[PDB]
Amino acid sequence: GKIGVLAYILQREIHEPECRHLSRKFTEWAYGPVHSSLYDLSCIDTCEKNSVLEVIAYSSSETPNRHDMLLVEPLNRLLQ
Amino acid sequence: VNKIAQESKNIWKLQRAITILDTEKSFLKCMRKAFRSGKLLQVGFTPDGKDDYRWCFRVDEVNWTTW
Amino acid sequence: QTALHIAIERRNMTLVTLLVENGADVQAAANGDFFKKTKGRPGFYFGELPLSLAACTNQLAIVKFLLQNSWQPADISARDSVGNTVLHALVEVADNTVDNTKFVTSMYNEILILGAKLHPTLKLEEITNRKGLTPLALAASSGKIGVLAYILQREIHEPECRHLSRKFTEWAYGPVHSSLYDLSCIDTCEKNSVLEVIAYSSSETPNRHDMLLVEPLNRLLQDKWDRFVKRIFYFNFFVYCLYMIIFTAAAYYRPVEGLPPYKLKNTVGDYFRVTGEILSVSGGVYFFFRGIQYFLQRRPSLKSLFVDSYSEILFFVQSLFMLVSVVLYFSQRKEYVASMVFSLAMGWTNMLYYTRGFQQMGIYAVMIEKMILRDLCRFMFVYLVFLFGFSTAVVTLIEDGKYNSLYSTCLELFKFTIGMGDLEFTENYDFKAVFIILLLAYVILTYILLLNMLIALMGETVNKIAQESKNIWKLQRAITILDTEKSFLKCMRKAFRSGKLLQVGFTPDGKDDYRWCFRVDEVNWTTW
Amino acid sequence: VYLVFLFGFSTAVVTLIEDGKYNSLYSTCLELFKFTIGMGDLEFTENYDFKAVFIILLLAYVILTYILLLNMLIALMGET
Amino acid sequence: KSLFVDSYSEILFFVQSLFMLVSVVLYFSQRKEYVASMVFSLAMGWTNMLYYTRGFQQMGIYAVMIEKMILRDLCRFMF
Numbered sequence: 054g055k056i057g058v059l060a061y062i063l064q065r066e067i068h069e070p071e072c073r074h075l076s077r078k079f080t081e082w083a084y085g086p087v088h089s090s091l092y093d094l095s096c097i098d099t100c101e102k103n104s105v106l107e108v109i110a111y112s113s114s115e116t117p118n119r120h121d122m123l124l125v126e127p128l129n130r131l132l133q
Numbered sequence: 134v135n136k137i138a139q140e141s142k143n144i145w146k147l148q149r150a151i152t153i154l155d156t157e158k159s160f161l162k163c164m165r166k167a168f169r170s171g172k173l174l175q176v177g178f179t180p181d182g183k184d185d186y187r188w189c190f191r192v193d194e195v196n197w198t199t200w
Numbered sequence: 201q202t203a204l205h206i207a208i209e210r211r212n213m214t215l216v217t218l219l220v221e222n223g224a225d226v227q228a229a230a231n232g233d234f235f236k237k238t239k240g241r242p243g244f245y246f247g248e249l250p251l252s253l254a255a256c257t258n259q260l261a262i263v264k265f266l267l268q269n270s271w272q273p274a275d276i277s278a279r280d281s282v283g284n285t286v287l288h289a290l291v292e293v294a295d296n297t298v299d300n301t302k303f304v305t306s307m308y309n310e311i312l313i314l315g316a317k318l319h320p321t322l323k324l325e326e327i328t329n330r331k332g333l334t335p336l337a338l339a340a341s342s343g344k345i346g347v348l349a350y351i352l353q354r355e356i357h358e359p360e361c362r363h364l365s366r367k368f369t370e371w372a373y374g375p376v377h378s379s380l381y382d383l384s385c386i387d388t389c390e391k392n393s394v395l396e397v398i399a400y401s402s403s404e405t406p407n408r409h410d411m412l413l414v415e416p417l418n419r420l421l422q423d424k425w426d427r428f429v430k431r432i433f434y435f436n437f438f439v440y441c442l443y444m445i446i447f448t449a450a451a452y453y454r455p456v457e458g459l460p461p462y463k464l465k466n467t468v469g470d471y472f473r474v475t476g477e478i479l480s481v482s483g484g485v486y487f488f489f490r491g492i493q494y495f496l497q498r499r500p501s502l503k504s505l506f507v508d509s510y511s512e513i514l515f516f517v518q519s520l521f522m523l524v525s526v527v528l529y530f531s532q533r534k535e536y537v538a539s540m541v542f543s544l545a546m547g548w549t550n551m552l553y554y555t556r557g558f559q560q561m562g563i564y565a566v567m568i569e570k571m572i573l574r575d576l577c578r579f580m581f582v583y584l585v586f587l588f589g590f591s592t593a594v595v596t597l598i599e600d601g602k603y604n605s606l607y608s609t610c611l612e613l614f615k616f617t618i619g620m621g622d623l624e625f626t627e628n629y630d631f632k633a634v635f636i637i638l639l640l641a642y643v644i645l646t647y648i649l650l651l652n653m654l655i656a657l658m659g660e661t662v663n664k665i666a667q668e669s670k671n672i673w674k675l676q677r678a679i680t681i682l683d684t685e686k687s688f689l690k691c692m693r694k695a696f697r698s699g700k701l702l703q704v705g706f707t708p709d710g711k712d713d714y715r716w717c718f719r720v721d722e723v724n725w726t727t728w
Numbered sequence: 729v730y731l732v733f734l735f736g737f738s739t740a741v742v743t744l745i746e747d748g749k750y751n752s753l754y755s756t757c758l759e760l761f762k763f764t765i766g767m768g769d770l771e772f773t774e775n776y777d778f779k780a781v782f783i784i785l786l787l788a789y790v791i792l793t794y795i796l797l798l799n800m801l802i803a804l805m806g807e808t
Numbered sequence: 809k810s811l812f813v814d815s816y817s818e819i820l821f822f823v824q825s826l827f828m829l830v831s832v833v834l835y836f837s838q839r840k841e842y843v844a845s846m847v848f849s850l851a852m853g854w855t856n857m858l859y860y861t862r863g864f865q866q867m868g869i870y871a872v873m874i875e876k877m878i879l880r881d882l883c884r885f886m887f
């Protein structure tokens with residue numbers, strides 16, 4: 054339920070040489086207030102065992118931000 | 134109810150997510166289309182000379198703040 | 201999209217200068233789907249033109265350069281694919297926040313000043329888009345309360361731009377001062393008066409409740425009310441009360457012989473009865489055609505039909521029940537009674553329509569409308585699920601009794617809700633323990649849990665909609681005013697108030713401007 | 729507001745009733761008022777034709793007054 | 809402990825099915841008490857319809873409140 058760390062990781066963008074591959078969010082274009090990103094979605098949608106969606110959905114209900122963690126941009130858009 | 138209205142507001146989304154995962158796990162038809170977003174080349178330049186395909190998902194967003 | 205759009209949106213003054221110098225087209229329209237409203241897809245609408253692009257982005261220097269450069273001046277009056285000019289675009293980009301309103305109104309004013317200085321004969325604010333909306337009408341329809349509030353009381357203190365003002369200060373003592381508001385296209389105009397645009401809003405408009413608090417509109421509506429409309433409204437209410445009394449009396453003394461229509465007897469009471477029936481049917485026809493007129497004029501979209509125009513639906517349905525009753529009456533079917541009573545019931549409850557427009561009692565009817573549409577419907581779905589589930593269980597358990605049917609057992613379980621549940625209404629079963637356990641579970645789940653949950657949820661909704669109802673009062677008063685003025689039944693011109701006064705008499709040219717100003721004295725005890 | 733609802737539905741019901749014991753504004757108004765105090769009979773007469781109309785009117789009156797209006801009164805009184 | 813504060817709807821659907829199967833067993837065991845089981849399943853079968861109201865922003869709140877109230881507040885009040 055570490056919503057802050059999760060929101061950081063899922064939206065991480067690193068603007069420097071030799072570390073762009075570490076990013077998970079990539080900005081293609083941005084005109085006004087509107088901009089189009091690409092999110093990695095490795096281990097969010099599907100993976101071997103612990104997809105993020107599967108981990109959140111099957112949380113034990115003691116997890117603090119289980120309700121709010123799905124508001125993080127890539128997950129909310131992916132689920133919709 | 135005055136204290137749990139806020140929680141229920143998002144429990145909506147949570148239950149929708151649970152429904153989605155169960156539907157994808159059952160699926161009853163050997164369907165692969167449930168895996169969305171397409172296999173795109175993101176950078177093409179790892180630390181070595183290989184190119185990376187990472188199944189990226191496009192999200193356009195509009196924010197009227199932080200000008 | 202062209203290089204000029206990129207330079208402007210990148211905020212590159214130098215590149216914009218170079219591109220204009222090199223023959224860039226300042227009228228090039230970026231008319232891709234990305235640059236349109238297109239609510240189902242991402243995008244950014246800005247009016248499609250470099251000038252509107254600069255204006256919407258709060259780049260005043262580029263606006264001035266594009267308007268008055270040496271190489272290619274921009275057409276201040278040019279219109280995009282929607283017909284929108286720069287000012288329409290500026291109205292579009294507003295979002296009613298403090299800084300957004302600040303810069304948008306500043307840019308709007310600066311564009312008006314520049315338009316006057318470059319084209320004194322040009323009236324930007326009269327230009328309409330493809331929907332027929334001026335920037336004022338667009339701001340009114342879209343609920344941009346900040347822009348509307350700016351425009352309606354705009355006062356410009358400089359030579360050769362006083363004619364652009366809409367508010368003029370005649371004299372000022374201390375906290376008190378007397379102004380004149382322009383009232384062009386507020387009170388009346390060709391199509392889109394501001395009052396008509398606000399009143400007939402689609403109920404998704406954000407500030408439709410609050411926009412009528414803006415000083416000139418609030419004062420104008422109160423003046424219209426007191427001078428003209430209050431008496432007509434009370435007369436209409438009185439006539440409706442008489443109509444419902446006549447309808448009630450005529451229905452109450454209906455004859456009880458079979459097979460209508462009933463032969464008229466040569467006696468006084470029957471002449472009064474048939475007279476009342478004729479008046480009742482007449483009122484039904486009147487409301488039927490009034491409802492059709494409403495629907496044709498407004499054309500609600502089958503979702504606005506109930507969340508708005510609710511009272512018009514109820515009046516129309518009343519008239520439909522009346523007319524169906526008439527048809528059955530002359531078709532020699534007693535079932536006309538079945539129709540008539542429904543109309544009669546509706547006819548009385550529609551009296552609550554007239555309580556809206558009173559700041560204390562109208563809130564009650566507004567709450568009834570909102571509750572019935574949303575919260576009662578959701579509650580009744582859940583309740584009916586419980587009721588039907590347990591009724592089916594109990595009637596399955598009962599074997600060959602008096603009840604032994606979905607109707608009887610559903611009614612008997614419903615009686616628990618109204619505090620009349622028998623709890624031993626039958627013994628025609630085996631397993632008394634099962635029967636009583638089912639009944640106790642149903643009682644606890646509905647009577648104790650669900651009803652108190654309903655009380656709590658209704659408390660929350662009432663706490664949340666009292667604030668909105670406080671202004672919905674004034675909104676309904678405005679709607680009443682506009683309908684009364686449109687009907688008017690007497691060819692009266694006095695409804696057009698405020699008198700034809702001279703503001704300046706000195707436009708950019710030698711003509712004089714009479715603009716139907718409205719005097720408003722205001723008192724402010726703050727900002728000393 | 730309550731008396732508007734009560735009178736409207738009382739007039740409807742007494743119009744529907746034909747030549748009964750009740751068949752009068754006073755008796756039917758009193759009988760419908762009994763629903764407010766948790767004593768509504770709900771089958772207080774059969775002297776009509778169209779039982780469906782009668783029961784639909786009574787159920788609509790009950791839902792509008794007993795369930796909606798009284799709880800709305802509770803909410804408004806809480807606010808006051 | 810998670811069995812009721814979470815997975816509540818799964819418990820209710822499972823209990824419905826248990827009542828159904830007990831009814832079948834009693835039915836073929838030549839006991840009329842199968843009726844006693846069946847009606848409970850029938851009642852549960854209808855109220856479990858509320859499971860499908862969750863996942864709708866407006867309707868689902870009602871069922872969520874029912875779940876939480878039954879588990880906590882109604883139990884304390886009823887004691």
Ligand SMILES: C=C(C)[C@]12C[C@@H](C)[C@@]34O[C@](Cc5ccccc5)(O[C@@H]1[C@@H]3C=C(COC(=O)Cc1ccc(O)c(OC)c1)C[C@]1(O)C(=O)C(C)=C[C@@H]41)O2
Pocket residue numbers: 510511512513514515517542545546547549550551552553556565566568569572576787788789791792
């Ligand atoms: C949703 C609308 C179309 C509605 C129209 C009719 C059939 C109505 O049943 C309802 C359905 C209903 C029935 C029973 C309980 C709740 C809801 O509610 C209203 C509608 C419900 C009402 C509620 O009372 C009011 O709305 C009065 C009123 C309030 C605010 C207004 O602005 C207003 O303007 C006309 C009228 C009373 C009835 O019209 C009535 O008297 C009878 C016989 C049935 C009621 O349908």
Ligand SMILES: C=C(C)[C@]12C[C@@H](C)[C@@]34O[C@](Cc5ccccc5)(O[C@@H]1[C@@H]3C=C(COC(=O)Cc1ccc(O)c(OC)c1)C[C@]1(O)C(=O)C(C)=C[C@@H]41)O2
Pocket residue numbers: 640641642644645816817818819820821823848851852853855856857858859862871872874875878882
């Ligand atoms: C605690 C659980 C295991 C529970 C299971 C059964 C026995 C139940 O009795 C209860 C005990 C009870 C009985 C009577 C009043 C309150 C509580 O409540 C629920 C449970 C209580 C319910 C309440 O209705 C609901 O929970 C519907 C529902 C709401 C939210 C959901 O996510 C849901 O998913 C299935 C279902 C209805 C019954 O299942 C029902 O229809 C009968 C015959 C008894 C009710 O036990």
